[PDB]
């Protein structure tokens, strides 16, 4: 229902979500059939930690643990979390530091303008996923090609883009043959899997890591700059007080809420949660944007990079919180800092209302971002 998915601009919650949120923190709406929308922050964490609710749309390839419930979800997640070791995070963070520098090095070498999405926001997230999956330098062109084949937009799998699946097929075979330090190697060689992951499981996880971390991280990075460019006092705070970068990124996650139209749950059971009667199989969707703006939790919900960090729902809650949230944070922290610091007097190169937003996409963001500097 488009009125729930559409965002006119990023500084307001959609009027229809605001209408529903007025009825209740959890409130029925009509699809097509009634589903519920959660706009309350405590209510959201409550549905997300609640086990009467499923991530399986159909029940009430494989290895795709984001639509799985524990026990089965928990087996893969724990394999995935275990390979997210300190040694990985440290190396990936240094890679990430290198990545954001090369893209800015390339923007500055190019002239005084760029489209931010082309030259920084899609490329930085993309290259980090390369490092994560152990994609070699000579294969990144091929890799960057096959995965900007999302138009417009979102898809599992690729129905049966095998081209991407085919690339991942070769990579895994490669990894079994020659084990490096990447996430695919560890799962195969060092995650202690019993039973051992199959090629299909391994392919399906690799795509999910790209899919899950790529649009979201790129939409965050582009939209965050776009918002800073319209809110010059905020931009200065981040650019001028560089030690406050950890708090700023946490604010953009909460204010921008790129996950649109929200996190999805289904009721395994007939249930009553917060006074509502919910038949089995009914969609429950947590609106990330509305909830991160709950006035009961945040008296002032407007954007403040001055604000000290607290929890928000941009990365989900409970058993499925982004596996990638620490990598996304390092890239968002590294990437916003490098642009504001290295691009003098950065500004939009076209008027703000001319900028193209993604309202025909699941993940909220910007299509193009023309910018200038000096
Ligand atoms: C967006 O609608 C999804 C959301 C389902 O619920 C969960 C919590 O699980 C889930 C799963 C298992 C996915 O496999 C998934 C995928 O691939 C994408 C995006 C998801 O949403 C997010 O998590 C945001 O971070 C998501 C899942 C999810 O949230 N990637 C895609 O490329 C994509 C296009 C998903 C949705 C597609 C269509 C909108 C869908 O066909 C429509 C029928 C929707 O109305 C939903 C019913 C949708 O269908 C499914 C099973 O994909 C589903 C509920
Ligand atoms: C700002 C950046 C990001 C945002 C806003 C974001 C948001 C989310 C959210 C809300 C979920 C929960 C969805 C659900 O509960 O159904 C999620 C799950 C996930 N994210 Fe992200 N994410 C980001 C970056 C990344 C990155 C960089 C990765 C890198 C691999 C990634 C991988 C995943 C995975 C694997 C899951 C599934 C976790 C599970 O089901 O166990 N994400 N993300």
Residues in the chain: 374
Going by C-alpha positions, the residue among 126, 128, 131, 123 that lies closest to residue 104 is 123
Alpha-carbon distance values, 51 to 45, 267, 280, 311 (Å): 12, 9, 13, 21
Question: What is the C-alpha to C-alpha distance for residues 249 and 245, in angstroms, rounded to an integer?
Answer: 6
- Omega prior to 71 cis, within 30 of 0: yes
Q: Are 209 and 65 in contact (CB under 8 A)?
A: no
List beta partners, residue 38: 26, 286
CA 312 distance to own-chain centroid: 14
Query: Which residue has a Cα nearest atom 1 of ligand 2?
Result: 217
List beta partners, residue 283: 266
Give the pairing type, strands 347-348 and 283-286: unpaired
Going by C-alpha positions, the residue among 102, 104, 337, 348 that lies closest to residue 239 is 337
Alpha-carbon distance values, 354 to 226, 232, 235 (Å): 12, 18, 20
Segments making up each domain of the chain, as ranges:
1-374
Going by C-alpha positions, the residue among 260, 274, 226 that lies closest to residue 362 is 260
Alpha-carbon distance values, 270 to 52, 273, 281 (Å): 9, 10, 8
Q: With helix as H, strand as E and coil as C, how does the chain read?
A: CHHHHCCCCCCCCCHHHHHHHHHCCEEEEECCCEEEEECCHHHHHHHHHCCCEECCCCCCCCCCHHHCCCCHHHHHHHHHHHHCCHHHHHHHHHHHHHHHHHHHHHHHHHCCEEEHHHHHHCHHHHHHHHHHCCCCHHHHHHHHHHCCCCCCCCCCCCCCCHHHHHHHHHHHHHHHHCCCCCHHHHHHHCCCCCCCCCHHHHHHHHHHHHHHHHHHHHHHHHHHHHHHHHCHHHHHHHHHCHHHHHHHHHHHHHHHCCECCCEEEEECCCEEECCEEECCCCEEEECHHHHCCCCCCCCCCCCCCCCCCCCCCCCCCHHHCCCCHHHHHHHHHHHHHHHHHHCCCCEECCCHHHCCECCCCCECCECCCEEECC
Question: What is the C-alpha to C-alpha distance for residues 325 and 317, in angstroms, rounded to an integer?
Answer: 11
Neighbour tally for 175: CB within 10 Å? 22
Question: What is the C-alpha to C-alpha distance for residues 188 and 190, in angstroms, rounded to an integer?
Answer: 6
Neighbour tally for 329: CB within 10 Å? 20
- Omega prior to 95 cis, within 30 of 0: no
Query: Which residue has a Cα nearest atom 25 of ligand 1?
Result: 259
Task: Tell me if 130 is assigned to a ligand binding site.
Answer: no
Radius of gyration of the CA atoms of the chain, in A: 21
List beta partners, residue 363: 259
Structure tokens of 270?
A: 């007939």
Question: What is the C-alpha to C-alpha distance for residues 294 and 304, in angstroms, rounded to an integer?
Answer: 15
Q: Are 285 and 262 in contact (CB under 8 A)?
A: yes
Which ligand minimizes its atom distance to the CA of 53?
1
Question: What is the C-alpha to C-alpha distance for residues 282 and 21, in angstroms, rounded to an integer?
Answer: 19
Q: Are 207 and 157 in contact (CB under 8 A)?
A: yes
Q: What is the CATH number of domain 1-374?
A: 1.10.630.10
User: Residue 316: which region, alpha, beta or left (left: phi > 0; alpha: psi -120 to 50)?
Assistant: left
Query: Which residue has a Cα nearest atom 6 of ligand 2?
Result: 315
Q: Which of 48, 211, 264 to mutate to test the pocket of ligand 1 (most atoms within 8 A of CB)?
A: 264
Q: At how many Å resolution was this determined? A: 2.6
Going by C-alpha positions, the residue among 207, 220, 226, 296 that lies closest to residue 251 is 220
* Residue in the block written with tokens 């289904």: 266
Protein residues whose CB sits closer than 6 Å to any atom of ligand 1: 55, 57, 66-67, 154-156, 211, 259, 263-264, 362
Q: Obtained via which technique?
A: X-ray
């Amino acid at each position: 229902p488009p009125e729930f998915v559409r965002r006119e601009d990023p500084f307001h919650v959609p009027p229809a979500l605001v209408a529903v949120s007025e009825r209740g923190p959890v409130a029925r709406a009509t699809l097509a059939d009634p589903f519920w929308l959660v706009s309350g922050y405590e209510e959201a964490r409550a549905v997300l930690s609640d086990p009467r609710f499923s991530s399986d749309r159909f029940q009430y390839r494989a290895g795709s643990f984001i639509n799985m419930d524990p026990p089965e979800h928990t087996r893969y997640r724990k394999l995935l979390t275990g390979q997210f070791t300190v040694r990985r995070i440290r190396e990936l963070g240094a890679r990430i530091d290198e990545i954001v520098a090369g893209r800015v090095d390339a923007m500055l070498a190019g002239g005084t303008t760029a489209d931010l999405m082309t030259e920084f926001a899609f490329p930085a997230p993309s290259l980090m996923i390369c490092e994560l999956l152990g994609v070699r330098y000579e294969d990144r062109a091929e890799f960057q090609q096959r995965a900007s084949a999302l138009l417009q937009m979102n898809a599992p799998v690729a129905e049966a883009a095998d081209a991407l699946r085919a690339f991942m097929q070769a990579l895994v075979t490669d990894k079994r043959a020659n084990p490096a330090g990447d996430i695919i190697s560890g799962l195969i060689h060092h995650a202690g899997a019993d039973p051992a992951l199959t090629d299909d499981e391994l392919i399906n996880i690799a795509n999910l890591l790209l899919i899950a971390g790529y649009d979201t991280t790129a939409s965050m990075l582009g939209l965050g700059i776009f918002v800073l460019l319209q809110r010059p006092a905020q931009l200065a705070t981040l650019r001028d007080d560089p030690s406050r970068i950890a708090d700023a990124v946490e604010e953009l996650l909460r204010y921008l809420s790129v996950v649109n139209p929200g996190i999805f749950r289904f009721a395994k059971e007939d249930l009553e949660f917060a006074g509502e009667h919910i038949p089995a199989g009914s969609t429950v969707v947590v609106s990330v944007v509305a909830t991160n703006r709950d006035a009961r939790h945040w008296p002032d919900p407007d954007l403040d990079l001055t604000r000290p960090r607290g929890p928000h729902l941009a990365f989900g809650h409970g058993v499925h919180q982004c596996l990638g949230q620490q990598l996304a944070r390092m890239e968002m922290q590294a990437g916003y800092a490098e642009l504001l610091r290295r691009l003098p007097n950065v500004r939009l190169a076209v008027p703000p209302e001319e900028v193209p937003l993604r309202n025909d996409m699941l993940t909220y963001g910007v299509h193009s971002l023309p910018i200038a500097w000096d």
